[PDB]
Amino acid sequence: TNTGRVYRPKDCERLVLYLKDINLPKLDKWGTSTLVAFLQQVLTYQGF
């Protein structure tokens, strides 16, 4: 589209990513997982 390339679910309307486990990924030595930081980026800014 306009304003940058985008992803859209094929042949459906509401794609659902069902993440199985959230406690289980790995901290670094400060306390911040890159996974939960990435999903924070997505659920706040709708992109990456």
Partner: protein, 48 residues
């Protein structure tokens, strides 16, 4: 049922990805034909 809701003819251009629904329904009907071969030969042996 959704055609019963809106009967404007260009709504089939704008449904929720009907193309694979139609092709898969056709393919499953072809397969139940291949299942019906045996019963067809039964009725052909019935009436000459």
């Amino acid at each position: 049922t959704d055609i019963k809701k809106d009967n404007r003819v260009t709504t089939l251009t704008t449904h929720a990805g009907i193309r694979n629904s139609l092709l898969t329904i056709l393919d499953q009907l072809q397969r139940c034909q291949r299942s019906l071969n045996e019963f067809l030969e039964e009725k052909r042996s019935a009436f000459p």
